[PDB]
Design a binder for this molecule. Structure first.
Ligand SMILES: CC(=O)N[C@H]1[C@H](O[C@@H]2[C@@H](O)[C@H](O)O[C@H](CO)[C@@H]2O)O[C@H](CO)[C@@H](O)[C@@H]1O
Ligand SMILES: CC(=O)N[C@H]1[C@H](O[C@@H]2[C@@H](O)[C@H](O)O[C@H](CO)[C@@H]2O)O[C@H](CO)[C@@H](O)[C@@H]1O
Ligand SMILES: CC(=O)N[C@H]1[C@H](O[C@@H]2[C@@H](O)[C@H](O)O[C@H](CO)[C@@H]2O)O[C@H](CO)[C@@H](O)[C@@H]1O
Ligand SMILES: CC(=O)N[C@H]1[C@H](O[C@@H]2[C@@H](O)[C@H](O)O[C@H](CO)[C@@H]2O)O[C@H](CO)[C@@H](O)[C@@H]1O
Ligand SMILES: CC(=O)N[C@H]1[C@H](O[C@@H]2[C@@H](O)[C@H](O)O[C@H](CO)[C@@H]2O)O[C@H](CO)[C@@H](O)[C@@H]1O
Ligand SMILES: CC(=O)N[C@@H]1[C@@H](O)[C@H](O)[C@@H](CO)O[C@@H]1O
Ligand SMILES: [Ca+2]
Ligand SMILES: [Ca+2]
Ligand SMILES: [Ca+2]
Length: 400
């Protein structure tokens, strides 16, 4: 089940044994999930010093652009889109190749502060197309294989800067809301959540308002205080809506056809009223049990809090599953990336954090409870010069 969000543009597999990837000063480095835990440099590019890559101008992702289920390195650079393909053996093509003179800072006028760039398999080809929410609307470049990307085309004249879409007010996602397996657009706009149905052919149907909530102008949902996710809360592979609001967690369940039901307060925690603050805490939805549905995970003050989904979008009690990864243990949103991702292959998401001095993990027992914290390795951390301003780090399934 693939959902692409602004916060998590690189989806991960359930089950999986996700790797760690880092775009450091000197290039691209990986920690292969395996019996030997080490940092390996794979490309002398896509780095602050290796190619002049900047977080304020360029976009760096992992995505399968060839169709072999081994994600490639994709960077939206200064004058075009650059790709280093995955060789399958802990190496990548170096140097990367320039596949399209668009979607770039000085080619097409793309801006981190104004626009969104994703890679997604929008036509079920098995290959990721380039997808951008730009000025005029959503632009796609078809991945025709073999490094051949077609000229960018307007997929739909909406969800663009020109239609009032703003990173400081609104949210945009790609997610299948119909069940046909095609990722549709989900946008939390000014006054409505809208969807736009993927027609399969590089176009989206007109925006349709589905929910008059979860937006700044409909309920007072703000970017700085009230995060929102799109995720399957029921198990039918159709995405639902979840928001962390003031009183707690609100949901709107998919009716099954890309229309959405009533908005309900389903849990009185993980909200502003329980102390949660975007500036100090991390809130995620991931599958932590064999039910294969969105459970709630929060990196709070004292540790990690979890509420398990009963299977139908209603939730059990909140339990502090570990007394670590929290604000009280030194964890800072502007320094220490945290992800909820299967690292062990059992289908139950685990925890990994890039800490001050070590990368730390903590493994799901298989039932949504967790074991003790493990120090994985002393690298890819603040202490080794990895900052949010100069580097990008992800959990990603590089080998499949
Ligand atoms: C960030 C980026 O795109 N780096 C690639 C580099 O891009 C340079 C631009 O940074 C510079 O402004 O202009 C030239 C065109 O004159 C390039 O497009 O190009 C490198 C290859 O020369 C590539 O390795 C970098 O990844
Ligand atoms: C950002 C956004 O939601 N854009 C949509 C646009 O939204 C406008 C608001 O920007 C404006 O503040 O108020 C009006 C209603 O009074 C709309 O909600 O509306 C468009 C028309 O539906 C839509 O296509 C844009 O995406
Ligand atoms: C962002 C959010 O939680 N919106 C929901 C709305 O929340 C308001 C608060 O914005 C305000 O601070 O406090 C009051 C209670 O006195 C509410 O909790 O509540 C709406 C339901 O009443 C809900 O639809 C909004 O999404
Ligand atoms: C943000 C957060 O962690 N909220 C949980 C709440 O945490 C509070 C702390 O915010 C505060 O600093 O101290 C008290 C204890 O002195 C709690 O740790 O704790 C709640 C109950 O455990 C939990 O429901 C909140 O989600
Ligand atoms: C944020 C983080 O890495 N927390 C772990 C903690 O790391 C600390 C740093 O917060 C501190 O600034 O430096 C010291 C060394 O003096 C540690 O590296 O270490 C804790 C246990 O060793 C761990 O539980 C925190 O998660
Ligand atoms: C930010 C943005 O949408 N840029 C697009 C660009 O990619 C596209 O090729 C061009 C075509 O007219 O128009 C805009 O300039
Ligand atoms: Ca669909
Ligand atoms: Ca569902
Ligand atoms: Ca696991």
């Amino acid at each position: 089940v693939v959902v692409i969000s602004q916060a998590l543009p690189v989806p991960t597999r359930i089950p999986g044994v996700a790797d760690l990837v880092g775009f450091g000063n000197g290039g691209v480095y990986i920690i292969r999930n395996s019996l030997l835990i080490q940092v390996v440099k794979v490309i002398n590019n896509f780095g602050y010093d290796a190619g002049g890559w900047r977080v304020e101008k360029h976009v760096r992702l992992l995505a399968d652009t060839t169709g072999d289920n081994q994600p490639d390195v994709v960077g939206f650079g200064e004058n075009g889109v650059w790709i280093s393909t995955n060789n399958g053996n802990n190496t990548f093509v170096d140097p990367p190749k320039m596949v399209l003179a668009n979607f770039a800072y000085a080619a097409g006028g793309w801006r981190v502060e104004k626009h969104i760039r994703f890679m997604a398999d929008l036509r079920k080809t098995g290959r990721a197309d380039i997808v951008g929410f730009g000025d005029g609307g959503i632009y796609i470049s078809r991945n025709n294989g073999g490094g051949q990307f077609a000229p960018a085309q307007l997929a739909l004249n909406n969800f663009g800067y020109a239609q009032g879409w703003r990173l400081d007010r609104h949210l945009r996602f790609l997610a299948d809301v119909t069940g046909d397996g095609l990722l549709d657009v989900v946008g939390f706009g000014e006054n409505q959540v809208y969807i736009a149905r993927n027609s399969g052919n590089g176009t989206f149907q007109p925006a349709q308002a589905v929910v008059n909530n979860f937006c700044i102008g409909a309920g007072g949902w703000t970017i700085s205080a009230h995060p929102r996710v799109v995720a399957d809360l029921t198990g039918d592979r159709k995405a639902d809506i979840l928001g962390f609001g003031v009183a707690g967690v609100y949901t709107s369940l998919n009716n099954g056809n890309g229309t959405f039901g009533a908005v309900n307060l389903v849990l009185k925690d993980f909200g502003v009223n329980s102390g949660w603050r975007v500036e100090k805490h991390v809130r995620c939805v991931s599958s932590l049990t064999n039910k294969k549905v969105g459970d709630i995970i929060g990196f709070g003050d004292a540790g990690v809090y979890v509420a398990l989904n009963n299977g139908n979008g209603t939730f059990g009690p909140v339990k502090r599953v570990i007394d670590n990864f929290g604000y009280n243990q030194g964890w800072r949103v502007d320094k220490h990336p945290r992800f909820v991702v299967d690292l062990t292959g059992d289908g139950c998401a685990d925890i990994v954090g890039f800490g001050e001095n070590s990368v730390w993990a903590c493994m799901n027992k298989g039932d949504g409870t967790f074991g003790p914290i493990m120090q994985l390795i002393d690298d890819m951390t603040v202490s080794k010069g990895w900052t949010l301003q100069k580097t990008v780090r992800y959990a990603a399934n590089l080998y499949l």
